[PDB]
């Protein structure tokens, strides 16, 4: 009986309650100690962890330290108190089923013990939690500390609560459902107290564990890609992997590439220009420079800021090339540059080898040379050796006729610098890629309606995430080997979306190449870190 | 133990009961406060909501406000009391199964909080409800109010009870059964009281939420369509959608079309007449007018009142046309009209283009012209420019030979005005269309027996519903995004039938085009609003 009535209740204490309160008087009187408060007499949600059938008996599923961030109201009280002492009560709620079976171990690890595969939890003083249990199992975490109280920001040695598999999960069916969800509920014990009030301006946890940076509208509203500034309408998985390093920021404060996160401008000053044909009338202007001549870019020397990282396609004559990256721009002379009036055109930029003779596409940035060839006729063609470009940052895709080529780019055309981390499918999970509807040259009126499927362009990660990750350091905010998981809820289903230590995003679709639409998406919700062996759910509307 | 014995029982109070009774004395003494009454010591049915496997953890299933309409006996007591105060007790009964799993959150939201996807119920003071639970979980709703009492008709700020998914519903089988039903039972608490008696003539809720308008006989007895005045014997689904706007009334007090809801008469005064052939003996009289010349119709100018909204079929010679709309009628001259004696015939009416030359069928009403051609020979043919028609409102279907053509109309032949809302299948639900056995011209004795299948004509919605909707305004009686659902019970099964904000009716048959017979239908029952993501049940007799 846990209702909203006057109620008798029973707030269960800890084993060391007489010595916890008495020695916590070094911080003064105990604060927020009152047993009739309704933040102390109820269980509230703390965390959910997935227990799958593919886990060893004794493998650790849920580990957490003694901390006031384990409860939503003691963490709220923690910003106005510079010190805490006392125990905590944990309740475990299993989703389960009648057909499922297997037990779990919940025990309080004393301080000074490593937590891992070698730890044997079944010989600790523990409680046993079935998969098919109705009434949730309650354990109490005593405050076993070498200090008198735990100051917030440096709590010292704290006990640890470890959830391990007592008997492995069995499903007598076979496939389909092969995982379960267990909910941890947390209530303060009798001896829990706060001491030594502080100003709430002081803060300890400033890394959300990459959380508050990805909210819901980011996907059903505002939100742009890393290649074009297009609105995100889809996630599309790729099996096998891909690599992106242009505006892709990892969880530390670093990147491997050029192009600071802003769609402003592409401007380069030194580099050679040419045009074919003996007649200087109605030709295609071709500009080239080598890799490593960008002195003005303070991040990386390999490219000007905003240069597209795609491989040049070899085309000649009056034919419009299939796919690619075109942008509107002009060529300008050096020595206090004023541009030439009679050359402003759409230009396709990219990476080649063997310019200006036999042009071949390139995969690696080392040994490559940046090329810039016009797709439309221009009445003047210059050939001066100091010359540069000025191309807008937002681009469109050049197409021969209408229809729909493919989602652009493909995973093999994307250029990488040396030393880049590659996405790899782990388990049944596979990486995703964020899609956006972009304008094209074969059809300017590419409204998302009739007259063939509209063109989709795919970038790696959302820009809000790039902006909110660039400033902060998250070297300990996510434990390697796991990913941080959000919970998307559609109108007729739900999905789990992960985020690794490398900036990549994962979904458990498996071997499928079908676009997933965020038309009916409503809300997202943080969950926390979860390991890579657990398959993210795919209970979609289909 | 809840029997019909003398009984000790326990009527569980609320947390603010001492201040709820004392401050509700502003309305005088508390009324209907007696703890031995059997309307206060028992749980009674309030609502049922469907919890499906396709719902996100934390998605809201059941929301309800603190109100005396939550109990069947306090709502009965509410018409004779102008004010109430006190709490309420809620009990949740799950159908469930042993093989099902997943939990729910029941919590009382304090006033001043929005209810939606952003609301997190799991951190409220709550109770947990399993899917496989036997004993029903009881929560108490305290009366947390900024006022002293809630006057009926304007209760002010009230607490809200929100049911959210704690762990998502899992079915280890696969398909087939993918939803569950949860029943909410409601009992008044200890401090519930009424104040300030009023005359029962005063009423607050006058919108049943479109409910009492659709009873059972409407389908197994009286009840007619919107096209012919035929008795309803079937519902037939269509996949893909359809549009009807003639006598189709949406949930507001409006329509998009002509034809007030009554099968009286079709009468038009101005329009041209003709007959082919040089001989004025045994010809087919052809009458035409343009769209927009109907001055006499006060609703819409596009047609006379009662004109059938079907596309004219092009036929010539002595052949009887297949399908269509024929009705008995005559042509009358203007200037205090007395009709011509020698022309009374069956006429096929409809919509064409390019009259009287190359006649083509029309889809949109704009740019069309109303046509009226006789199917049988008539000994006189007039050609006077002011002439009109007088055709009875009830019609029959013209057929070349007996047999059975198809159900008429098809979804593509039905004409629409510009600005019409179209039916669309959402989820596994699909729209239905009400069938009726109508007389034909190829076989007058079309009794529902032997000698081929009888002809079926289909209209959009039942007329009782059109009559009972025309007068009242239901702008808030059904929350958009959902539909109001009734529960049909046959002799060997049951079905859920929905009703949206546009007047369309839904059933969860899926991709099937099979007629469903209301021969063994017995009773219907209201349920309430239910969202469009939930699939309506199809446990039929087969």
Curated annotation (Swiss-Prot), chains A, B:
Membrane-spanning residues: none
Cellular localisation: Virion; Host cytoplasm
Assembly, per entry: Homomultimer. Interacts with host type II histo-blood group structures antigens at the surface of target cells.
Residues of the full protein shown: 1795 to 2336 of 2344
Function: Capsid protein VP60 self assembles to form an icosahedral capsid with a T=3 symmetry, about 35 nm in diameter, and consisting of 180 capsid proteins. A smaller form of capsid with a diameter of 23 nm might be capsid proteins assembled as icosahedron with T=1 symmetry. The capsid encapsulate VP2 proteins and genomic or subgenomic RNA. Attaches virion to target cells by binding histo-blood group antigens, inducing endocytosis of the viral particle. Acidification of the endosome induces conformational change of capsid protein thereby injecting virus genomic RNA into host cytoplasm.
Annotated source species: Rabbit hemorrhagic disease virus (strain AST89)
Protein name (record): Capsid protein VP60
């Amino acid at each position: 009986m846990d209702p909203g009535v006057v109620a008798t209740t029973s707030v269960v204490t800890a084993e060391n309650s007489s010595a916890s309160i008495a020695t916590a008087g070094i911080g003064g009187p105990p604060q927020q100690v009152d047993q009739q408060e309704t933040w102390r007499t109820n269980f509230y949600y703390n965390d959910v962890f997935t227990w799958s059938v593919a886990d060893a008996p004794g493998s650790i599923l849920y580990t957490v330290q003694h901390s006031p961030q384990n409860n939503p109201f003691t963490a709220v009280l923690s910003q106005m108190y510079a010190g805490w002492a006392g125990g905590m009560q944990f309740r475990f709620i299993v989703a389960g089923s009648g057909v499922f079976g297997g037990r779990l171990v919940a025990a309080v690890i004393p301080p000074g013990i490593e937590i891992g595969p070698g730890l044997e939890v079944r010989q600790f003083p523990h409680v046993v939690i079935d998969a098919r249990s109705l009434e949730p199992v309650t354990i109490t975490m005593p405050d076993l500390r070498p200090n008198m109280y735990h100051p917030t920001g440096d709590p010292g040695l704290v006990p640890t609560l470890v959830l391990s598999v007592y008997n492995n999960l069995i499903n007598p069916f076979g496939g389909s459902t092969s995982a379960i969800q267990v909910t941890v509920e947390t209530r303060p014990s009798e001896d829990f107290e706060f001491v030594m009030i502080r100003a709430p301006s002081s803060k300890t946890v400033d890394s959300i564990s990459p959380a508050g940076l990805l909210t819901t509208p980011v996907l059903t509203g505002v939100g742009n890609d890393n290649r074009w500034n297009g609105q995100i309408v889809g996630l599309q998985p790729v099996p096998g992997g891909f690599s992106t390093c242009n505006r892709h920021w990892n969880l530390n404060g670093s990147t491997y590439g050029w192009s600071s996160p802003r769609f402003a401008d592409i401007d380069h000053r030194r580099g050679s220009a040419s045009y074919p044909g003996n007649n200087a009338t109605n030709v295609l202007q071709f500009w080239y420079a080598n890799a490593g001549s960008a002195i003005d870019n303070p991040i990386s020397q390999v490219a000007p800021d905003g240069f597209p990282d795609m491989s040049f396609v070899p085309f000649n004559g009056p034919g419009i090339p299939a796919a690619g990256w075109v942008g509107f721009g002009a060529i300008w002379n050096s020595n206090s540059g004023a541009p030439n009036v009679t050359t402003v055109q759409a230009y396709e930029l990219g990476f080649a080898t063997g310019a200006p003779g036999n042009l071949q596409p390139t995969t690696n940035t080392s040994g490559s040379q940046t090329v810039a060839k016009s797709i439309y006729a221009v009445v003047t063609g210059t050939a001066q050796n100091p010359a540069g470009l000025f191309v807008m940052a937002s681009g469109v895709i050049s197409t021969p006729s209408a229809n729909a080529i493919t989602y652009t780019p493909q995973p093999d055309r994307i250029v990488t610098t040396p030393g880049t981390p590659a996405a790899a499918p782990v388990g049944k999970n596979t990486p995703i890629m964020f899609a956006s509807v972009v304008r094209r040259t074969g059809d300017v009126n590419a409204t998302a309606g009739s007259a063939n499927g509209t063109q989709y362009g795919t970038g790696s990660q959302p820009l809000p995430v790039t902006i909110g990750l660039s400033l902060n350091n998250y070297s300990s905010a996510l434990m390697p080997g796991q990913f941080f998981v959000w919970q998307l809820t559609f109108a007729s289903g739900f999905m789990e979306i992960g985020l690794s230590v490398d900036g990549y995003f994962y979904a458990g679709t498996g071997a499928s190449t079908t676009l997933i639409d965020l038309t009916e998406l409503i809300d997202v919700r943080p969950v926390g870190p979860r390991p890579s062996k657990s398959t993210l759910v795919f209970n979609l509307g289909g």
